[PDB]
């Protein structure tokens, strides 16, 4: 499992490089901390119009102006 690895690195380095790159491409998106930021950036990219809501009277988490405190903020994206 180690002498076989040295043998296949001696005979066929192309397939060893291919299986190593493919194995890292499989495992490393889960072992990474920055993978969640890909999800967050792709879900915070505004392709549509943010259709507003009628104010029924009791919605504390929804702002009234873009320059309000509450609302989803992208301080993490500006700073990183």
């Amino acid at each position: 499992v180690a002498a076989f690895l040295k043998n296949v690195w001696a005979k066929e380095p192309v397939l060893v490089a291919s299986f190593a790159i493919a194995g890292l491409a499989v495992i490393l998106p889960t072992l990474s901390p920055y993978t969640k930021y890909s999800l967050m950036i792709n879900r915070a990219t505004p392709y549509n119009y943010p259709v507003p809501l009628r104010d029924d009277g009791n919605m504390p988490d929804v702002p009234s102006h873009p320059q309000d405190p509450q609302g989803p903020s992208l301080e993490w994206l500006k700073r990183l």
């Binding site: 009628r54 009234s64 989803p72």
Partner: protein, 171 residues
Amino acid sequence: PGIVELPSLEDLKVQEVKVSSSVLKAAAHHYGAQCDKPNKEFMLCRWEEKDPRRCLEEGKLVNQCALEFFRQIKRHCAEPFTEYWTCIDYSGLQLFRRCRKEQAQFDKCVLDKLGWVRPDLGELSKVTKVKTDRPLPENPYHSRARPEPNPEVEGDLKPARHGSRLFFWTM
């Protein structure tokens, strides 16, 4: 069918905002900051009514508040704004990233002479709540009543009377 009720030409006339798209894109973030309320009441009326014929006057309110946005730039800070939208206007894709010193001059002169804060990255894409006095549409699709569903099955399931009733099979 019924005659579609299109409004008259006099009910459509308004004072247009006759500026080009680079003028609008250079003046976009401050317009989203300062002209928030009639814009969101109009687009709430536009997605609730699903009909522009009932969204006319609020739309004119947009076209009443956009011009007063630009006049207040024209009285105070027309020259940094002109120097900014000219550099916006040069580019093919109209990049914000090519015009940062003219952006800083326009934001500085606007924050001084008018006090407008350019919004942060992430804020203009927010879903906001809108307080209106107009009613909620009870049927925006103008749909008629649904046909009544079939009566469902109920009751305890009894065995079949004398089996299958298939010619001579008694079970």
